[PDB]
Design an enzyme around this catalytic site. Structure first.
Site, PDB file in Angstrom:
ATOM      1  N   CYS A 200      -9.754   8.598  10.672  1.00  6.07           N
ATOM      2  CA  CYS A 200     -10.829   7.811  10.090  1.00  6.07           C
ATOM      3  C   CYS A 200     -11.597   6.944  11.111  1.00  6.07           C
ATOM      4  O   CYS A 200     -12.828   6.750  10.972  1.00  6.07           O
ATOM      5  CB  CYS A 200     -10.293   6.981   8.906  1.00  6.07           C
ATOM      6  SG  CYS A 200      -9.028   5.730   9.284  1.00  6.07           S
TER       7      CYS A 200
ATOM      8  N   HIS B  92      -7.219   1.914   5.123  1.00  2.00           N
ATOM      9  CA  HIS B  92      -8.171   2.987   5.384  1.00  2.00           C
ATOM     10  C   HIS B  92      -9.437   2.373   6.007  1.00  2.00           C
ATOM     11  O   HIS B  92      -9.677   1.192   5.855  1.00  2.00           O
ATOM     12  CB  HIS B  92      -8.518   3.639   4.021  1.00  2.00           C
ATOM     13  CG  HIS B  92      -9.359   4.864   4.129  1.00  2.00           C
ATOM     14  ND1 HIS B  92      -9.114   5.853   5.060  1.00  2.00           N
ATOM     15  CD2 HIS B  92     -10.434   5.282   3.412  1.00  2.00           C
ATOM     16  CE1 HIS B  92     -10.030   6.805   4.943  1.00  2.00           C
ATOM     17  NE2 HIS B  92     -10.833   6.489   3.950  1.00  2.00           N
TER      18      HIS B  92
ATOM     19  N   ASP C 134     -16.913   7.452   2.697  1.00  2.68           N
ATOM     20  CA  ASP C 134     -15.461   7.514   2.900  1.00  2.68           C
ATOM     21  C   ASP C 134     -15.184   8.783   3.680  1.00  2.68           C
ATOM     22  O   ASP C 134     -15.400   9.879   3.186  1.00  2.68           O
ATOM     23  CB  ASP C 134     -14.772   7.581   1.554  1.00  2.68           C
ATOM     24  CG  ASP C 134     -13.284   7.404   1.637  1.00  2.68           C
ATOM     25  OD1 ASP C 134     -12.668   8.115   2.472  1.00  2.68           O
ATOM     26  OD2 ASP C 134     -12.735   6.606   0.779  1.00  2.68           O
TER      27      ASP C 134
END
Lengths: 154, 154
Positions: free
Chosen positions: A20, A105, A123
């Site tokens: 991420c 996250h 996302d």
């Protein structure tokens, strides 16, 4: 309308540690071969000597890769207009947040939906142009660290 | 690059009196049946009586039609980023400016072309999605009046 950036590109992560991080920097427009040395929990929620080391690694990358952090209100609470104002100044903002399993996250903030009191984000796992309640963002943002919200200086 | 709004509708001034005012305000989403009583030079470049009057007239219009003005910087210069920030908050912005040929005009700012250091604007007499250099915009904007750059409060 207002308070929406409109082609922040979408990048989905690879399934690897820090996947991420790489996708999110890419959405801000950076091509960065390095990232945090450990996991997101360490990056966004450490303490004592570990907290201090992770902080030094982050400042390192911020300096080297032309990223800066948002000054965080002591309230632990943004208004819609505050966030909207930051986005329109700074462009897309990468943020660390804690999800409902306790996993951390990263995502990229792109806009504000004022009528439904919501943030608009990409996302890297779930897709582009999601929203979540502003109340959820404030609740889940990584307030414990000054590097909770990073924006590009480039 | 640069922040760009992508659907501001284009409206041409036809062969109407103060036609650029009606066109620009229509491009901003407003239907306004009346406009400044004197012309463009008086609206954008007057001082003394003919100017304190047109300042009063314009504030009244703004109050009545939910328009507001951008606070002009002391330096008499905008950056590409700052104009983008402004468009991101307020939507399209109608601006008064003086042409090389000496006349005053109104146009609608819609976006910024960062790579080429230019503004993107709808010109009611020349067409949609023109650009001009940012240096030109700063040189020719109606700096003398606080209502140089108007936007929609709706």
């Amino acid at each position: 309308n207002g308070f929406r950036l409109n082609h922040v590109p979408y990048v989905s992560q690879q399934n690897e540690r820090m996947g991420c991080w790489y996708a999110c920097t890419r959405m801000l427009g950076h091509s960065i071969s390095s990232g945090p040395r450990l996991g997101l929990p360490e990056l966004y929620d450490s303490s004592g000597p570990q907290g201090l080391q992770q902080r030094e690694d982050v400042l390192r990358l911020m300096r080297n890769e032309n990223l800066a952090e948002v000054s965080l209100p002591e309230s632990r609470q943004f208004s819609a207009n505050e966030l909207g104002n930051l986005l329109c100044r700074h462009g897309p903002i990468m943020f660390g947040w804690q999800t409902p399993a306790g996993s951390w996250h990263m995502s990229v903030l792109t806009g504000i939906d004022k009528p439904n009191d919501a943030i608009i984000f990409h996302d890297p796992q779930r897709g582009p142009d999601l929203t979540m309640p502003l109340d959820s963002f404030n609740q889940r943002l990584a307030w414990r660290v000054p590097h909770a919200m990073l924006y590009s200086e480039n």
